[PDB]
């Protein structure tokens, strides 16, 4: 069954270039209106709503390596800590520096010793500041709906209050950027901010990049289903040259008691992902015209490697339409579900290119996957 002439399969991928009312996106000036529709769809049907930022008062305090972020909403206020690491002069770069805001530590896990491997060193040595926070401080990874976000915005089932945990974590990243824009760390350039996260935090990194236009680089790492991976296209059992694909995460697993708190109540009622009014090529395209880098592993089957490619190819159509196709990149590598040194180095190479003009040695526009006419069904509008 390796003859691909007889392996094709067609899903309907909701068209990025069709407005909610059925008319077509034709001009560059049409895109902002279409993007707002997609943001409204994703908030109502999947993640819940980002709160109005205009009525949040953000203050900060710096003590050694700790940046304390404090936010006040009405008569309530809540704080959480972020850890700051800056480059030295010997990096060959002077302040202010671009900054990687990491949801979780920028660090890998050694399965032999169960010790962590700090990759924030790689970043500061290449002239990137690193600010990390612990996402559970902002919202716990469960259905208690507690943490700094929910102190300020108590959860309920009313549409305006039914905000899921991934949107809460993304809000955490945005609050650090708020403090940086207010000059909390003068050595950091808030206009060169990069958001990154692994696995569950990679889903939230993508949400942060789609809903907060100030991030210059968005890096969902191994984000999988509910992140960059297509809901409608998965390839369990397909024979690749590096192996037979395992199962991608099941839609119902996203909705159940171990993960459903990531999303809202509407999302948890769907019977089938084909009922969603979008697929994830649209969430990625919400980052345009800012830059996005999809990283992960070719053998990380639960995150749906080729379905992530499907979403990337479809999202890139919007980037092409806007005239900035170079700003979306793809970089899977060998192996499985992990933060590896190569993942971090690929991010830093992508940032040096997009932010500093340094030409990369990697081709960020291709992969091991072919482009399959069966799923390559989003097309750029004619001029």
Numbering used by the authors: 12 to 394
The authors write:
In addition to determining the structure of CBM9.3, we were also able through renewed efforts to crystallize and determine the structure of the previously biochemically characterized GE15 domain of CkXyn10C-GE15A.15 Residue numbers in this section reflect the numbering as in the PDB file, where Glu22 corresponds to Glu1340 in the full-length protein sequence. We were also able to determine the 3D structure of the GE domain, which represents the first structure of a GE from a hyperthermophilic organism. As expected from previously determined structures of CE15 enzymes, the overall structure is an α/β-hydrolase fold with the active site located in a shallow pocket, and as in other studied bacterial GEs, there are no disulfide bonds. Within the active site, the catalytic serine-histidine-glutamate/aspartate triad is conserved and easily identifiable in CkGE15A and is comprised of Ser210, His348, and Asp311. Compared to previously studied GEs, one of the major differences in CkGE15A is that it lacks two inserts previously found in bacterial enzymes (Reg1 and Reg3) and has a rather different structure of the aromatic-rich Reg2, implicated in the interaction with the lignin portion of the substrate. In the structure of TtCE15A from T. turnerae, rather than a loop, Reg2 is found as a helical protrusion with several aromatic residues that could provide binding sites for complex biomass.22 In CkGE15A, Reg2 is uniquely formed by a β-hairpin, which presents several aromatic residues toward the active site (Phe120, Trp122, Trp125, and Phe127), thus possibly playing a role in substrate recognition and binding moieties such as hydrophobic lignin fragments or a xylan chain. A similarly positioned residue within the loop is not present in CkGE15A due to a sharp turn at Gly115; however, it is possible that Tyr212 could play a similar role, as it is in the same spatial area.
The hyperthermophilic bacterium Caldicellulosiruptor kristjansonii encodes an unusual enzyme, CkXyn10C-GE15A, which incorporates two catalytic domains, a xylanase and a glucuronoyl esterase, and five carbohydrate-binding modules (CBMs) from families 9 and 22. C. kristjansonii has been shown to grow on a variety of polysaccharides, including cellulose, xylan, starch, and pectin, with an optimal growth temperature of 78 °C. From the N-terminus, CkXyn10C-GE15A consists of two CBM22 domains (CBM22.1 and CBM22.2), a GH10 endo-xylanase (Xyn10C), three CBM9 domains (CBM9.1, CBM9.2, and CBM9.3), a GE from CE15 (GE15A), a cadherin domain, and two surface layer homology (SLH) domains believed to anchor the protein to the Gram-positive cell wall. Collectively, the results show that all five CBMs have their own distinct binding preferences and appear to complement each other and the catalytic domains in targeting complex cell wall polysaccharides. We have determined the structures of the third CBM9 domain (CBM9.3) and the glucuronoyl esterase (GE15A) by X-ray crystallography.
